[PDB]
Paper text:
Ryanodine receptors (RyRs) are large homotetrameric calcium-permeant ion channels in the membrane of the endoplasmic/sarcoplasmic reticulum (ER/SR). Cardiac RyR2 channels open in response to the action potential during systole and mediate excitation–contraction coupling by effecting massive release of calcium ions from the SR lumen into the cytosol of cardiac myocytes. The N-terminal region of hRyR2 (amino acids 1–606) is the target of >30 arrhythmogenic mutations and contains a binding site for phosphoprotein phosphatase 1. Genetic diseases leading to cardiac arrhythmia [catecholaminergic polymorphic ventricular tachycardia (CPVT1) and arrhythmogenic right ventricular dysplasia (ARVD2)] are caused by RyR2 mutations that increase the diastolic calcium leak.
Here, we present the X-ray and SAXS structures of the human RyR2 N-terminal fragment encompassing amino acids 1–606 (hRyR21–606) obtained at physiological chloride levels. The structure of hRyR21–606 determined at 2.39 Å consists of three domains: A (residues 10–223) and B (224–408) adopting a β-trefoil fold, and C (409–544) formed by a bundle of five α-helices. The first α-helix of domain C (referred to as the central helix) is positioned in the centre of the structure and forms contacts with all three domains. Most of the interactions between domains A/C and B/C involve the central helix, strongly suggesting a significant role of this helix in maintaining the integrity of the N-terminal fragment. Residues 1–9, 79–106, 379–386 and 545–606 are not visible in the hRyR21–606 structure. No Cl− anion was found in hRyR21–606 and the structure did not show any evidence of a chloride-binding site as had been observed in the mouse RyR21–547 structure. Significantly, despite the presence of chloride anions in our crystallization solution, there was no electron density in the close proximity of Arg420 in the hRyR21–606 structure to be assigned to a Cl− anion. In hRyR21–606 this site is comprised predominantly of Arg417, Arg276 and Tyr125 side chains that form a net of interdomain interactions that do not match those described for mRyR21–547, but resemble those observed in oRyR1. Thus, the N atoms of Arg417 are within hydrogen-bonding distances of carboxyl O atoms of the domain A aspartate, glutamate and serine (Asp61 OD2, Glu40 OE2 and Ser63 OG). The Arg420 NH1 atom forms a hydrogen bond to the main-chain O atom of Val300 and Arg298 NH1 of domain B. Moreover, the guanidine group of Arg420 makes a face-to-face stacking interaction with that of Arg298.
Residue numbers in the entry: 10 to 25, 26A, 27 to 78, 107 to 378, 387 to 544
């Protein structure tokens, strides 16, 4: 009945907070690119608004004892020191040296970091109550205290006079660990929750997607099937997300409901009332409207609450080999196509076509990561452009969201991400990195990233000096004006280099 935690498992860390007088269960979150600091992701509201668990997922990489200064899936014990590697970025949860918190000032920031050298990235696990003691096994759903090895502070939910962040402070916070996947349950070519994938009519040679990264950002909401090069572009990528936190990263089965998120725009596949398909904002992505399922055929689910299996005895879904039928849970309708006598329209219907058979195709790590970096960049840069827009339209600088600091940080990360291989590498090694590089470039180009960079350049160029920008946007904005522009140019050069 009870579940322990072992090294190599994926987990999330949750706490409860009072927001507008009410309790919410939140995950410890962090983005790789563009800001290394931890923040929080609500999970309690999942039936109305789907949480993004990708930024919340950590692997317990090590679990060491007292005399120390992975192993074979050692079990977590109270009093052990742990290392948490962020799944999405390759980085680790660290107690940093900086203090961006006026509230406490004896608190240290907590964020992501790759330098794993000191003690800053180690945390010791401690009992919340008398019901657990040093040496005992940490159970799933145990309330935990985490203590930084370098700084002796608690992993702490801070009510910063604004609102909610995480830090390391001498006040404690109760965290509970939820399991996401097992480090010993292998992938083996099967569909796992959290996967980024493409959905194909294999025989028709096409994939489910949306209109190209061009005009009609509102137009980009519609859904259709398309053959050709789109099958190796970002816009045909979808992230499958289960409806629960626990085990959201294990094997998916026939009948098991899920949302499907369009990676590039971050919107969720949904059925409207007039019964047409449309991508919805996270804020409107309710279960009834966004929940779908795979079915081994179009027969009947009426066998009770008994596990569904294919024509072989296997309950899981295989990449490549399995034929799948997407069903909207709430209406029971099928995801089909319709001919408009390069592409054809995706629709929901009770009959369908005899060849609705979707084949699944796992995306590569490389293209998946890239697709996600694009979504972050577009989101951040759209805020930046909008903020710049309000300012030119005379809005009071204090009321405007202008993410100067994130923009500098993202551009640095982005430039690094497009850095060509240094000469001193072996020839075959350089060739490989040059290939990854071209792919990153192609995916960025197809998503219209060049025009977006040019758009940010143009908006900054309205101003004639740093001091002119300072006058409208404030001193700190003024002092990054030229460095942001330089970075924008550098990034733009990186996008086209070697074409």
């Amino acid at each position: 009945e009870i579940q322990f935690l072992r090294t190599d498992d994926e987990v999330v860390l949750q706490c409860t907070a009072t927001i507008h007088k009410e309790q919410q269960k939140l995950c410890l979150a962090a983005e790789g690119f563009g800001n290394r600091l931890c923040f929080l992701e609500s999970t309690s509201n999942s039936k109305n608004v789907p949480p993004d668990l990708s930024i919340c997922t950590f692997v317990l990489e090590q679990s060491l004892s007292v005399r120390a200064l992975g192993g074979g899936h050692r079990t977590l014990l109270y009093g052990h020191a742990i290392l948490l590697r962020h799944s999405y970025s390759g980085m680790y949860l660290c107690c940093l040296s900086t203090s961006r918190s006026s509230t406490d000032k004896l608190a240290f920031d907590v964020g992501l970091q790759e330098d794993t050298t000191g003690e800053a990235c180690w945390w010791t696990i401690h009992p919340a109550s008398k019901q657990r003691s040093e040496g005992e096994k940490v159970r799933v759903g145990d309330d935990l205290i985490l203590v930084s090895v370098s700084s002796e502070r608690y992993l702490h939910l801070s009510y910063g006079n604004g609102s909610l962040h995480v830090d390391a402070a001498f006040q404690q916070t109760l965290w509970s660990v939820a399991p996401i996947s097992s480090g010993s349950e292998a992938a083996q070519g099967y569909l796992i929750g959290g996967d980024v994938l493409r959905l194909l009519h294999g025989h028709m040679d096409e994939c489910l997607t949306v209109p190209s990264g061009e005009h009609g950002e509102e137009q980009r909401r519609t859904v259709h099937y398309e053959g050709g090069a789109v099958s190796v572009h970002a816009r045909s990528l979808w992230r499958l997300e289960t409806l629960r936190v626990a085990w959201s990263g294990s094997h998916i089965r026939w009948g098991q409901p899920f949302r499907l998120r369009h990676v590039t725009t971050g919107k969720y596949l949904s059925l409207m009332e007039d019964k047409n398909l449309l991508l919805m904002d996270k804020e409107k992505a309710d279960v009834k409207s966004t929940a779908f399922t795979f079915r081994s055929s179009k027969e009947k689910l009426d066998v009770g609450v008994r596990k569904e299996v294919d024509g072989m005895g296997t309950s899981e879904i295989k990449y490549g080999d399995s034929v799948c039928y997407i069903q909207h849970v709430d209406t029971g309708l099928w995801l089909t196509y319709q001919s408009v006598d390069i592409q054809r329209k995706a629709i929901m219907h009770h009959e369908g076509h005899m060849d609705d058979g979707i084949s699944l195709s796992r995306s590569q790590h490389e293209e998946s990561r890239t697709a996600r970096v694009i979504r972050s960049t577009v989101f951040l840069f759209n805020r930046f452009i909008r903020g710049l827009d309000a300012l030119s339209k005379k809005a009071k600088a204090s009321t405007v969201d202008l993410p100067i600091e994130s923009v500098s940080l993202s551009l640095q990360d982005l430039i690094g991400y497009f850095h060509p291989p240094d000469e001193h590498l072996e020839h075959e090694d350089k060739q490989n990195r040059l290939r990854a590089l071209k792919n990153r470039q192609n995916l960025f180009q197809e998503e219209g990233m060049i025009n977006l960079v040019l758009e940010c350049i143009d908006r900054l160029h309205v101003y004639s000096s740093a001091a002119h920008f300072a006058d409208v946007a404030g001193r700190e904005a003024g002092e990054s004006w030229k460095s942001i522009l330089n970075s924008l140019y550098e990034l733009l050069a990186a996008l086209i280099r070697g074409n």
